[PDB]
Amino acid sequence: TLNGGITDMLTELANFEKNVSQAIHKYNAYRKAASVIAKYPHKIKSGAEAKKLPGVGTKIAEKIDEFLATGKLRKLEKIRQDDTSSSINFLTRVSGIGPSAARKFVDEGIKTLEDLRKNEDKLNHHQRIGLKYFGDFEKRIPREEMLQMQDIVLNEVKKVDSEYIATVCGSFRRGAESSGDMDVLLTHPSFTSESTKQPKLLHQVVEQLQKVHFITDTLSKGETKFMGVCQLPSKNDEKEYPHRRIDIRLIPKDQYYCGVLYFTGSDIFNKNMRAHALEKGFTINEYTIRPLGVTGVAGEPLPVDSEKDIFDYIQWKYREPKDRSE
DNA sequence: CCGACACCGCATCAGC
DNA sequence: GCTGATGCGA
DNA sequence: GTCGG
Ligand SMILES: O=c1ccn([C@H]2C[C@H](O)[C@@H](COP(=O)(O)NP(=O)(O)OP(=O)(O)O)O2)c(=O)[nH]1
Ligand SMILES: [Cl-]
Ligand SMILES: [Cl-]
Ligand SMILES: [Cl-]
Ligand SMILES: [Cl-]
Ligand SMILES: [Mg+2]
Ligand SMILES: [Mg+2]
Ligand code: NA
Ligand code: NA
């Protein structure tokens, strides 16, 4: 973090545009800049120097000069002191409360953790659980704990059906020393792009994980995506571990590589790679990579037998997971 | 200039 | 009930 | 907010 000060500033700006301005493109613009700057191997000495990087334009360049000179940004100095913006940014930290619900609550006089707690009847299910674990979800997960969680999930999944294959993706697969949550990609031979010869595939696993008291709550649950909460079991007299967010995605067995590519991320890396694909005339999603006919319509799925294959199509040299943390 | 900006699952809603 | 639009995941 | 054509 040679340019931590600058990347943080950009991220704060990004969050403001997203949560308060509800301006998604400005949000992604700031995030892109923060990203490219974060991997820049030098201690930025000026905005001009930064403007050389792709994604950093005139505005961010001037902002970087202000920052380098004063150590702060007036624009943010202001935003920080605006109560409505401050309340809004805060409420969006609760899982399930977005920019819209956040602004709505602020309109109704609900702007503090305290307020949220005394108005649970005004929250939907997800938001209710997000509030419950507000503190816990703010904590990072040491890789060591991810390893223990991985063991349980794979072993429990195995027990349900030896034919299940559970892979931990997200930041964990990228080699991070800490993770915001645990993301699990799941496959089973009975569920392919061709057919679903067995129902309740995801349910059965969620079921088992709940039985062994690993999954404590559910934020949302469908046929192929589970979003919930889990906790590692603690020892006698040992204090309890924090509750953790867990995402489970059931993907067609024959679309594993596109699935693992997607779920490994990062989200910004996928955004960059998917944009490059488009420039190259392809479209990539968690299921497949399809060509783009002049008419704009996507074509039939191209054959894929490795993450690398996807990279080859868009003429990108393969990049290891550990190098996709953009 | 100015249009494009990655992609999609599940919860919840309004209109029918 | 359905379907389409929106919010949120993120 | 930034970019390519
Ligand atoms: O906007 C998104 C969000 C997620 N994803 C993919 C990539 C990401 O790495 C993966 C898992 O989502 P998380 O939100 O769990 N992020 P990640 O695991 O990378 O980091 P963290 O440690 O915060 O969980 O899903 C996208 O493609 N787009
Ligand atoms: Cl925008
Ligand atoms: Cl600042
Ligand atoms: Cl695939
Ligand atoms: Cl597809
Ligand atoms: Mg994650
Ligand atoms: Mg996740
Ligand atoms: Na630039
Ligand atoms: Na939130």
Short mmCIF file of C-alpha atoms (C1' of nucleotides) and ligand atoms in Angstrom, two decimals:
data_model
loop_
_atom_site.label_atom_id
_atom_site.label_comp_id
_atom_site.label_asym_id
_atom_site.label_seq_id
_atom_site.Cartn_x
_atom_site.Cartn_y
_atom_site.Cartn_z
CA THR A 1 0.00 0.00 0.00
CA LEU A 2 2.44 2.63 -1.27
CA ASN A 3 -0.53 4.80 -2.17
CA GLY A 4 -2.95 3.77 0.56
CA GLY A 5 -3.95 7.34 1.32
CA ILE A 6 -4.98 7.91 -2.29
CA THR A 7 -6.74 4.57 -2.81
CA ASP A 8 -8.73 5.04 0.41
CA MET A 9 -9.80 8.53 -0.74
CA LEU A 10 -10.97 7.14 -4.04
CA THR A 11 -12.84 4.32 -2.30
CA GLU A 12 -14.58 6.76 0.07
CA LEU A 13 -15.52 8.84 -2.96
CA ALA A 14 -16.72 5.66 -4.68
CA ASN A 15 -18.90 4.72 -1.71
CA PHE A 16 -20.40 8.20 -1.63
CA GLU A 17 -21.39 8.17 -5.29
CA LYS A 18 -22.88 4.70 -4.84
CA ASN A 19 -24.73 5.15 -1.53
CA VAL A 20 -25.65 8.85 -1.50
CA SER A 21 -25.62 9.95 -5.15
CA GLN A 22 -26.93 6.62 -6.40
CA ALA A 23 -24.57 7.16 -9.35
CA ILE A 24 -23.30 3.67 -10.19
CA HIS A 25 -20.98 4.61 -13.04
CA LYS A 26 -19.16 7.22 -10.97
CA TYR A 27 -18.93 4.51 -8.32
CA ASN A 28 -17.26 2.07 -10.68
CA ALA A 29 -15.14 4.86 -12.15
CA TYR A 30 -13.61 5.63 -8.74
CA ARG A 31 -13.20 1.92 -7.99
CA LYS A 32 -11.40 1.34 -11.28
CA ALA A 33 -8.99 4.16 -10.51
CA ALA A 34 -8.45 2.95 -6.95
CA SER A 35 -7.72 -0.48 -8.40
CA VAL A 36 -5.24 0.51 -11.12
CA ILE A 37 -3.52 2.88 -8.67
CA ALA A 38 -3.38 0.19 -5.98
CA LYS A 39 -1.29 -2.09 -8.19
CA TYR A 40 0.91 0.76 -9.46
CA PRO A 41 4.45 -0.21 -8.26
CA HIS A 42 5.53 3.36 -7.39
CA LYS A 43 4.74 5.93 -4.69
CA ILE A 44 2.70 8.39 -6.74
CA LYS A 45 4.23 11.88 -6.62
CA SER A 46 1.48 13.75 -8.51
CA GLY A 47 -1.86 13.72 -10.29
CA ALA A 48 -0.20 13.98 -13.69
CA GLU A 49 1.82 10.87 -12.84
CA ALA A 50 -1.45 9.20 -11.93
CA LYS A 51 -3.31 10.43 -14.99
CA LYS A 52 -0.98 8.26 -17.06
CA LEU A 53 -2.74 5.19 -15.69
CA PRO A 54 -5.93 4.08 -17.48
CA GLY A 55 -9.02 4.99 -15.48
CA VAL A 56 -7.46 8.05 -13.91
CA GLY A 57 -8.59 11.20 -15.68
CA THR A 58 -8.43 14.96 -15.10
CA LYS A 59 -10.81 15.10 -12.12
CA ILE A 60 -9.15 12.32 -10.13
CA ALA A 61 -5.79 13.79 -11.14
CA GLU A 62 -6.63 17.15 -9.55
CA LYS A 63 -8.07 15.39 -6.52
CA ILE A 64 -4.80 13.52 -6.12
CA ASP A 65 -2.85 16.80 -6.22
CA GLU A 66 -5.07 18.30 -3.54
CA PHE A 67 -4.58 15.17 -1.44
CA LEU A 68 -0.81 14.99 -1.89
CA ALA A 69 -0.49 18.65 -0.95
CA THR A 70 -2.88 18.96 2.01
CA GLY A 71 -3.26 15.34 3.05
CA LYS A 72 -7.00 15.56 2.56
CA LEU A 73 -9.85 16.36 0.20
CA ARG A 74 -12.23 19.23 0.95
CA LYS A 75 -15.00 17.56 -1.03
CA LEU A 76 -14.81 14.61 1.38
CA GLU A 77 -14.17 16.91 4.35
CA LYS A 78 -17.62 18.28 3.53
CA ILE A 79 -19.42 15.02 2.77
CA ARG A 80 -18.23 13.76 6.15
CA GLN A 81 -19.93 16.63 7.97
CA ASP A 82 -23.27 16.27 6.18
CA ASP A 83 -25.58 14.38 8.52
CA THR A 84 -27.84 12.98 5.81
CA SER A 85 -24.89 11.62 3.83
CA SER A 86 -23.30 10.27 7.01
CA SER A 87 -26.48 8.48 8.08
CA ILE A 88 -27.01 7.05 4.61
CA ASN A 89 -23.45 5.73 4.28
CA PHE A 90 -23.81 4.11 7.69
CA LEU A 91 -27.13 2.35 7.10
CA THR A 92 -25.88 0.80 3.84
CA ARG A 93 -23.31 -1.06 5.95
CA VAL A 94 -26.11 -3.29 7.21
CA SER A 95 -26.47 -6.28 4.89
CA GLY A 96 -29.73 -5.99 2.98
CA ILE A 97 -30.03 -2.22 3.31
CA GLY A 98 -29.05 -0.53 0.06
CA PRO A 99 -28.84 3.15 -1.04
CA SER A 100 -32.60 3.26 -1.55
CA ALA A 101 -33.74 1.65 1.70
CA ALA A 102 -31.06 3.67 3.46
CA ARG A 103 -32.40 6.99 2.17
CA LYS A 104 -35.95 5.86 2.93
CA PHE A 105 -35.15 5.05 6.57
CA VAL A 106 -33.35 8.38 6.99
CA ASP A 107 -36.54 10.05 5.72
CA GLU A 108 -38.45 8.20 8.42
CA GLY A 109 -36.06 9.27 11.16
CA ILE A 110 -34.29 5.92 11.41
CA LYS A 111 -30.60 6.75 11.16
CA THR A 112 -28.74 4.96 13.94
CA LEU A 113 -27.97 1.42 15.00
CA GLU A 114 -30.25 2.18 17.94
CA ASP A 115 -33.04 3.28 15.61
CA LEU A 116 -32.70 0.16 13.53
CA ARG A 117 -32.90 -2.01 16.64
CA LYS A 118 -36.14 -0.47 17.90
CA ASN A 119 -37.72 -0.70 14.44
CA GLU A 120 -37.07 -4.31 13.46
CA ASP A 121 -40.70 -4.50 12.35
CA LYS A 122 -39.74 -2.11 9.58
CA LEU A 123 -37.04 -4.40 8.19
CA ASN A 124 -37.38 -7.36 5.83
CA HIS A 125 -35.83 -10.76 6.67
CA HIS A 126 -32.36 -10.21 5.24
CA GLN A 127 -32.01 -6.74 6.75
CA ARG A 128 -33.16 -8.18 10.08
CA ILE A 129 -30.33 -10.73 10.11
CA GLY A 130 -27.85 -8.16 8.81
CA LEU A 131 -28.63 -5.99 11.79
CA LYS A 132 -28.35 -8.97 14.14
CA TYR A 133 -24.80 -9.70 12.98
CA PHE A 134 -23.84 -6.10 12.20
CA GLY A 135 -20.74 -6.31 14.34
CA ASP A 136 -19.70 -9.79 13.28
CA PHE A 137 -20.04 -9.15 9.53
CA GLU A 138 -17.66 -6.19 9.95
CA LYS A 139 -14.90 -8.58 11.00
CA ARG A 140 -12.42 -10.22 8.61
CA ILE A 141 -11.92 -13.99 8.59
CA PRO A 142 -8.33 -15.15 9.21
CA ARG A 143 -7.26 -17.64 6.53
CA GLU A 144 -6.72 -20.14 9.35
CA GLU A 145 -10.46 -19.99 10.14
CA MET A 146 -11.31 -20.28 6.43
CA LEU A 147 -9.33 -23.51 6.39
CA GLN A 148 -11.35 -24.91 9.33
CA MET A 149 -14.59 -23.83 7.62
CA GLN A 150 -13.48 -25.43 4.37
CA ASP A 151 -12.90 -28.77 6.13
CA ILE A 152 -16.39 -28.83 7.57
CA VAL A 153 -18.16 -27.84 4.36
CA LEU A 154 -16.28 -30.31 2.14
CA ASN A 155 -16.61 -33.13 4.67
CA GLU A 156 -20.28 -32.43 5.29
CA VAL A 157 -20.95 -32.15 1.57
CA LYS A 158 -19.07 -35.41 0.99
CA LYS A 159 -21.28 -37.12 3.58
CA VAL A 160 -24.48 -36.02 1.80
CA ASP A 161 -23.28 -37.48 -1.51
CA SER A 162 -19.73 -38.47 -2.38
CA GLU A 163 -20.46 -37.17 -5.88
CA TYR A 164 -20.76 -33.54 -4.77
CA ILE A 165 -17.75 -31.31 -5.45
CA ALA A 166 -17.38 -28.22 -3.28
CA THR A 167 -14.72 -25.65 -4.11
CA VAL A 168 -14.03 -22.57 -1.98
CA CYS A 169 -13.61 -19.59 -4.29
CA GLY A 170 -13.63 -15.81 -3.87
CA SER A 171 -10.71 -14.16 -2.10
CA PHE A 172 -9.87 -17.48 -0.42
CA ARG A 173 -9.01 -19.13 -3.75
CA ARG A 174 -7.03 -16.00 -4.69
CA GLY A 175 -4.80 -16.76 -1.69
CA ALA A 176 -5.93 -13.93 0.60
CA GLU A 177 -4.70 -14.01 4.21
CA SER A 178 -8.14 -12.86 5.33
CA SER A 179 -11.60 -12.91 3.74
CA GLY A 180 -14.79 -10.91 4.05
CA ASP A 181 -16.80 -14.14 3.78
CA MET A 182 -16.70 -17.68 2.43
CA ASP A 183 -17.83 -18.45 -1.13
CA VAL A 184 -18.51 -22.04 -2.09
CA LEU A 185 -19.04 -23.29 -5.63
CA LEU A 186 -20.92 -26.57 -5.84
CA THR A 187 -21.38 -29.17 -8.58
CA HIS A 188 -23.01 -32.59 -8.86
CA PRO A 189 -23.19 -34.93 -11.87
CA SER A 190 -27.00 -34.98 -11.68
CA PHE A 191 -27.16 -31.26 -12.57
CA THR A 192 -25.71 -30.20 -15.91
CA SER A 193 -26.55 -27.67 -18.62
CA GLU A 194 -28.41 -30.58 -20.24
CA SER A 195 -30.68 -31.58 -17.35
CA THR A 196 -31.51 -31.62 -13.63
CA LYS A 197 -31.97 -35.32 -12.91
CA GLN A 198 -32.19 -34.61 -9.17
CA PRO A 199 -34.10 -31.85 -7.30
CA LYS A 200 -33.26 -30.22 -3.93
CA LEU A 201 -29.55 -30.49 -4.80
CA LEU A 202 -28.63 -27.23 -3.07
CA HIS A 203 -31.30 -27.71 -0.40
CA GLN A 204 -29.89 -31.06 0.70
CA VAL A 205 -26.49 -29.52 1.38
CA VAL A 206 -27.86 -26.40 3.06
CA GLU A 207 -29.96 -28.85 5.09
CA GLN A 208 -26.99 -30.92 6.26
CA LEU A 209 -24.92 -27.84 7.11
CA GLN A 210 -27.79 -26.59 9.24
CA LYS A 211 -28.09 -29.98 10.97
CA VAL A 212 -24.47 -29.91 12.17
CA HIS A 213 -25.15 -26.36 13.32
CA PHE A 214 -22.73 -24.79 10.85
CA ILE A 215 -25.31 -22.65 9.00
CA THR A 216 -27.18 -20.51 11.53
CA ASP A 217 -29.28 -18.20 9.35
CA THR A 218 -30.54 -17.72 5.80
CA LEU A 219 -30.53 -14.38 3.99
CA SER A 220 -31.88 -15.74 0.70
CA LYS A 221 -32.21 -19.18 -0.82
CA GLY A 222 -33.09 -20.44 -4.28
CA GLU A 223 -32.43 -23.42 -6.56
CA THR A 224 -28.86 -22.41 -7.36
CA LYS A 225 -27.81 -19.70 -4.92
CA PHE A 226 -27.76 -19.69 -1.13
CA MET A 227 -26.85 -16.60 0.89
CA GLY A 228 -26.64 -17.15 4.61
CA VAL A 229 -24.66 -17.16 7.82
CA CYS A 230 -22.40 -19.72 9.48
CA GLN A 231 -20.23 -20.22 12.56
CA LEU A 232 -17.27 -22.42 13.44
CA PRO A 233 -17.88 -24.58 16.51
CA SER A 234 -15.90 -23.48 19.57
CA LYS A 235 -14.35 -25.60 22.33
CA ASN A 236 -15.27 -25.92 26.00
CA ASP A 237 -15.00 -22.62 27.86
CA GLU A 238 -13.66 -21.27 24.58
CA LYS A 239 -15.40 -18.07 23.52
CA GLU A 240 -17.52 -18.23 20.41
CA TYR A 241 -16.19 -17.37 16.97
CA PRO A 242 -18.00 -14.54 15.13
CA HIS A 243 -20.87 -15.39 12.82
CA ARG A 244 -19.78 -15.30 9.16
CA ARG A 245 -21.47 -14.68 5.83
CA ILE A 246 -21.48 -17.70 3.51
CA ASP A 247 -22.42 -17.82 -0.18
CA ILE A 248 -23.14 -21.09 -1.96
CA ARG A 249 -23.62 -21.35 -5.71
CA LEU A 250 -24.78 -24.54 -7.46
CA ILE A 251 -23.44 -24.58 -11.02
CA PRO A 252 -23.92 -27.05 -13.91
CA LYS A 253 -21.12 -29.62 -13.80
CA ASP A 254 -20.17 -29.03 -17.46
CA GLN A 255 -19.89 -25.28 -16.87
CA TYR A 256 -17.50 -25.57 -13.94
CA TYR A 257 -14.60 -23.60 -15.41
CA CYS A 258 -16.77 -20.64 -16.32
CA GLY A 259 -18.28 -20.95 -12.85
CA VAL A 260 -15.00 -21.17 -10.96
CA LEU A 261 -13.59 -18.27 -13.03
CA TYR A 262 -16.59 -16.12 -12.07
CA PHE A 263 -16.69 -17.02 -8.35
CA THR A 264 -12.92 -16.63 -7.93
CA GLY A 265 -13.05 -12.99 -8.98
CA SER A 266 -12.25 -10.41 -8.00
CA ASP A 267 -15.40 -8.58 -9.03
CA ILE A 268 -13.31 -5.83 -10.60
CA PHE A 269 -11.13 -8.43 -12.31
CA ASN A 270 -14.26 -10.04 -13.78
CA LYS A 271 -15.52 -6.62 -14.87
CA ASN A 272 -12.24 -5.90 -16.62
CA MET A 273 -12.05 -9.37 -18.17
CA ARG A 274 -15.69 -9.29 -19.30
CA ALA A 275 -15.19 -5.87 -20.86
CA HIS A 276 -12.10 -7.10 -22.69
CA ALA A 277 -14.07 -10.09 -23.89
CA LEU A 278 -16.66 -7.75 -25.40
CA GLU A 279 -13.93 -5.76 -27.20
CA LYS A 280 -12.73 -9.10 -28.56
CA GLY A 281 -16.27 -9.97 -29.61
CA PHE A 282 -17.18 -12.42 -26.87
CA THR A 283 -19.47 -12.41 -23.86
CA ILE A 284 -18.59 -14.22 -20.65
CA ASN A 285 -20.84 -15.10 -17.70
CA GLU A 286 -20.58 -17.70 -14.94
CA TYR A 287 -21.99 -20.32 -17.31
CA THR A 288 -20.24 -19.88 -20.66
CA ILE A 289 -18.35 -17.77 -23.14
CA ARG A 290 -20.26 -17.05 -26.34
CA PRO A 291 -19.24 -15.16 -29.50
CA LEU A 292 -21.01 -11.94 -30.53
CA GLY A 293 -22.68 -11.83 -33.93
CA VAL A 294 -22.69 -8.49 -35.78
CA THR A 295 -26.40 -8.25 -34.95
CA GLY A 296 -25.29 -7.98 -31.33
CA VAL A 297 -26.95 -11.25 -30.31
CA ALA A 298 -24.83 -13.80 -28.46
CA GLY A 299 -24.05 -17.03 -30.28
CA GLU A 300 -23.80 -20.62 -29.07
CA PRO A 301 -21.42 -21.59 -26.22
CA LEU A 302 -17.79 -22.26 -27.16
CA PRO A 303 -16.07 -25.39 -25.77
CA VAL A 304 -14.25 -24.88 -22.47
CA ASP A 305 -12.03 -27.35 -20.62
CA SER A 306 -9.95 -25.11 -18.38
CA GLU A 307 -9.97 -21.61 -16.99
CA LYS A 308 -7.09 -20.98 -19.39
CA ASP A 309 -9.28 -21.79 -22.39
CA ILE A 310 -11.48 -18.83 -21.55
CA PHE A 311 -8.41 -16.59 -21.37
CA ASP A 312 -7.16 -17.89 -24.72
CA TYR A 313 -10.36 -16.93 -26.55
CA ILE A 314 -10.03 -13.29 -25.53
CA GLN A 315 -6.29 -13.44 -26.22
CA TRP A 316 -5.27 -12.79 -22.62
CA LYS A 317 -2.32 -14.63 -21.12
CA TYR A 318 -3.53 -16.86 -18.32
CA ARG A 319 -3.46 -15.21 -14.91
CA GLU A 320 -3.24 -17.24 -11.71
CA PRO A 321 -5.97 -16.69 -9.11
CA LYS A 322 -3.47 -14.92 -6.84
CA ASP A 323 -2.97 -12.38 -9.63
CA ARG A 324 -6.68 -11.59 -10.13
CA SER A 325 -7.08 -9.45 -7.00
CA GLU A 326 -7.90 -6.18 -8.73
"C1'" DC B 1 -18.89 14.82 -28.58
"C1'" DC B 2 -21.44 10.86 -26.68
"C1'" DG B 3 -22.65 6.40 -25.80
"C1'" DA B 4 -20.88 2.60 -23.34
"C1'" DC B 5 -19.68 1.27 -18.79
"C1'" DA B 6 -20.04 -7.15 -16.73
"C1'" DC B 7 -23.41 -10.11 -15.52
"C1'" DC B 8 -27.11 -12.43 -13.04
"C1'" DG B 9 -29.99 -14.98 -8.64
"C1'" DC B 10 -33.45 -14.17 -5.25
"C1'" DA B 11 -36.71 -11.06 -2.59
"C1'" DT B 12 -40.40 -7.99 -3.11
"C1'" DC B 13 -43.42 -5.33 -5.32
"C1'" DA B 14 -47.27 -3.29 -8.77
"C1'" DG B 15 -50.29 -4.19 -12.29
"C1'" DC B 16 -53.20 -7.48 -14.41
"C1'" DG C 1 -51.65 -16.64 -9.53
"C1'" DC C 2 -48.49 -14.49 -13.33
"C1'" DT C 3 -44.92 -11.25 -15.24
"C1'" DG C 4 -42.09 -7.34 -15.45
"C1'" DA C 5 -39.40 -3.56 -12.67
"C1'" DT C 6 -36.82 -2.64 -8.96
"C1'" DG C 7 -33.53 -3.31 -5.02
"C1'" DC C 8 -29.75 -5.76 -3.27
"C1'" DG C 9 -26.55 -9.09 -3.15
"C1'" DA C 10 -22.22 -6.02 -4.01
"C1'" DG D 1 -15.74 9.94 -14.04
"C1'" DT D 2 -13.20 8.00 -17.95
"C1'" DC D 3 -12.73 6.14 -22.19
"C1'" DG D 4 -12.50 5.08 -27.50
"C1'" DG D 5 -13.86 6.20 -32.07
O1 LIG E 1 -20.20 -7.59 -8.25
C1 LIG E 1 -19.82 -8.75 -8.12
C2 LIG E 1 -19.64 -9.44 -6.88
C3 LIG E 1 -19.02 -10.64 -6.88
N1 LIG E 1 -18.54 -11.24 -8.03
C4 LIG E 1 -17.80 -12.50 -8.00
C5 LIG E 1 -16.28 -12.26 -7.91
C6 LIG E 1 -16.06 -12.33 -6.40
O2 LIG E 1 -14.72 -12.64 -6.05
C7 LIG E 1 -16.99 -13.48 -6.03
C8 LIG E 1 -17.34 -13.60 -4.56
O3 LIG E 1 -18.03 -12.44 -4.11
P1 LIG E 1 -17.60 -11.69 -2.77
O4 LIG E 1 -18.53 -10.55 -2.64
O5 LIG E 1 -17.63 -12.76 -1.74
N2 LIG E 1 -16.07 -11.14 -2.97
P2 LIG E 1 -14.58 -11.79 -2.70
O6 LIG E 1 -14.71 -13.17 -2.18
O7 LIG E 1 -13.72 -11.54 -3.89
O8 LIG E 1 -13.94 -10.96 -1.60
P3 LIG E 1 -14.30 -10.91 -0.12
O9 LIG E 1 -13.16 -11.44 0.67
O10 LIG E 1 -14.80 -9.54 0.16
O11 LIG E 1 -15.46 -11.82 0.11
O12 LIG E 1 -18.17 -13.24 -6.84
C9 LIG E 1 -18.73 -10.64 -9.27
O13 LIG E 1 -18.37 -11.14 -10.32
N3 LIG E 1 -19.36 -9.42 -9.23
CL CL E 2 -23.39 7.12 -12.83
CL CL E 3 -10.13 13.31 3.04
CL CL E 4 -17.02 -24.09 -18.49
CL CL E 5 -25.31 -18.75 -20.82
MG MG E 6 -16.04 -13.54 -0.69
MG MG E 7 -19.55 -13.84 -0.98
NA NA E 8 -5.48 8.06 -17.57
NA NA E 9 -25.83 -3.02 2.84
#
